[PDB]
């Protein structure tokens, strides 16, 4: 019974898994009360009289979004101590997330990770959902990922980070939070994916005609991506990919595991059924830079390895024709040492459409997770924000007061610097 | 039996008729909460009215249906606006309307509002109008058995 444990950390993580477990319950016919009117044994566990408790853990240092699930419609779905709530937040501080407060909630967190892995009979990986722009997603996630790599070293560590936008901020101190968090997701995760917020604003505007998106509009697109990642782990069909071959077929070198994402049947009922949707154009829209869920314009650099996971009524013949037309156009320029870099999954279950949100019954789907050397521009807009902040030693007095002696700012800067030249020599 | 008695009114001139119980097969249902004398309702009603006619009576099968629930303060005012709304409505003296409002959390500026519903009776799509947005809901969403 192949399965994963999803660890949601930070306020972004609580709300991402809020819509993500809405989609998973609606996918497997599970009520908010936890009942039913082998696919369910990937995200839910049977608890006697027709009860399917989820296999996640909600984690946050502030008790204002997790208890805000404890009094909601899914209040009687999650296990009561599966929702772990801290007492003081980190308040946009990597030092407060990693050094002070911190460990008091961590030893209770792996008390639930170990207990959830007891019921696991062939655990396939961990799915962290966190923001590296905040404090309890960055600092707490750093110590969490480092300690899980001590306990479960060989297990997959799929890491879904909402990386800070080039322009959209909602703070000013996110140059300090994410760069200090870089030393965590660069040598303690297995496949990290960047999910930039303003890019997901643009896919909700250019495609959906929604010029006023809120956070739950973004979170349903995130849930639609993750559902397609784990669709092959619950529903059967054509040529499949699991998570174990997901690392090996997309990660060329162990130092490089940052990844992109784009889901592109993405359209509301205004245009969905009038437009003819087929594998030729939904793949062409997935590779389109306007549909990309990070500000990682792939005209820059080379591609390295792309995974195309389609869910719905796709036969294996016209997926090969769709991939062939990707090779022919010149704008998609590949790297010279990976000729046959294309891994295709085809499922049978169509995308489970959430009511209320702006999604239609697209019978086909695409789910791109593609590696590229254009990820260096995501971290090169990052380093001049860190350099201008740290040029005259500002905003660090909060960090050095609560643990975090001076020098972790400098080694994290040269760690992410060496990441850029790492991507430089991997190209040409 | 959900709604139960005659309380679901079908419009008719000369005499007053209740719509039959299993009328709602193969159609998509939206509750329209409104209140007469409201400035916003005065423009939301004609737009959803033109949409009602255009969407529903192009296809030979009826595709949408709108149930009118009102926050009126006067039964004559309710009657003269039910005579203005061309879709299904509910009785003023019936307490089913109070049950629907108290369930669906309609305050006594969120008015007017749409809640498209599923076959069992729960919320399937929420649509306010506080400010081209009406086309968002699709008739082929709530295909009922």
């Amino acid at each position: 019974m192949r399965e994963v444990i999803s660890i949601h950390v930070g306020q972004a993580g609580i709300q991402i898994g809020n819509a993500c477990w809405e989609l998973f319950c609606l996918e497997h016919g599970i009520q908010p009360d936890g009942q039913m009117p082998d696919a369910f044994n990937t995200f839910f566990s049977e608890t006697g009289a027709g009860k399917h408790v989820p296999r996640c853990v909600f984690l946050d240092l502030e008790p204002t979004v997790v208890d805000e699930v404890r009094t909601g419609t899914y209040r009687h779905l999650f296990h009561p101590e599966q929702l772990i709530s801290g007492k003081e937040d980190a308040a946009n501080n990597f030092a407060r997330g990693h050094y002070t407060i911190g460990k008091e909630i961590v030893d209770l967190s792996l008390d639930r990770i170990r207990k959830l892995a007891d019921n696991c009979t062939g655990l396939q990986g961990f799915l962290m959902f966190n923001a590296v722009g905040g404090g309890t997603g960055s600092g707490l996630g750093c110590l969490l990922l480092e300690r899980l790599s001590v306990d479960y070293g060989k297990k997959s560590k799929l890491n879904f980070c909402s990386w800070p936008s080039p322009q959209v901020s909602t703070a000013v101190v996110e140059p300090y939070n994410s760069v200090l968090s870089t030393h965590s997701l660069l040598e303690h995760t297995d496949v990290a994916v960047m999910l930039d917020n303003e890019a997901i604003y643009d896919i909700c505007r250019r495609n959906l005609d929604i010029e006023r998106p809120t956070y739950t509009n973004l979170n349903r697109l995130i849930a639609q991506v993750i559902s397609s990642l784990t669709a092959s782990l619950r529903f059967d069909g054509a040529l499949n990919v699991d998570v174990t071959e997901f690392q090996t077929n997309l990660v060329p070198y162990p130092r490089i595991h940052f990844m992109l994402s784009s889901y592109a049947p993405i359209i509301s009922a205004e245009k969905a059924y009038h437009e003819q949707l087929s594998v030729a154009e939904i793949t062409n829209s997935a590779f389109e830079p306007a549909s990309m869920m990070a500000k990682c314009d792939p005209r820059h650099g080379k591609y390295m390895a792309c995974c195309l996971m389609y869910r719905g009524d796709v036969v294996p013949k016209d997926v090969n024709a769709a991939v062939a037309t990707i090779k022919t156009k010149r704008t998609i320029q590949f790297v010279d040492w990976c000729p046959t870099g294309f891994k295709c999954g085809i499922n049978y279950q169509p995308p489970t459409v959430v009511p209320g949100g702006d999604l239609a019954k697209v019978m086909r789907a695409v789910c791109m997770i593609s590696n590229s050397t254009a990820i260096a521009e995501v971290f090169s807009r990052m380093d001049h924000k860190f350099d201008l902040m740290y040029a005259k030693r500002a905003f660090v007095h909060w960090y050095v007061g609560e643990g975090m002696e001076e020098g972790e700012f400098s080694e994290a800067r040269e760690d992410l610097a060496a990441l850029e030249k790492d991507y430089e020599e991997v190209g040409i | 039996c959900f709604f139960g008695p005659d309380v679901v009114k079908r419009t008719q001139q000369g005499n007053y008729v209740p719509v039959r119980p299993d009328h709602f097969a193969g159609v998509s249902v939206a509750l329209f909460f409104a209140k007469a004398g409201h400035s916003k309702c005065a423009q939301i009603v004609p737009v959803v009215r033109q949409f009602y006619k255009t969407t529903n009576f192009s296809g030979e099968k009826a595709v949408i249906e709108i149930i009118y629930v009102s926050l009126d303060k006067d039964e004559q005012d309710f009657e003269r606006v039910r005579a203005l709304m061309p879709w299904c409505s509910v009785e003023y003296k019936s307490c089913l309307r109070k049950k629907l409002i108290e369930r669906y959390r309609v305050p006594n500026t969120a008015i007017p509002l749409l809640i498209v519903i599923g076959p069992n009776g729960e919320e399937a799509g929420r649509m306010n109008f506080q400010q081209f947005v009406l086309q968002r809901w699709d008739y082929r969403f709530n295909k009922w058995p």
Partner: peptide, 12 residues
């Protein structure tokens, strides 16, 4: 809020 469950996908 609670949502309508989708109709069951009959086997084909």
């Amino acid at each position: 809020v609670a949502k309508p469950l989708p109709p069951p996908v009959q086997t084909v």
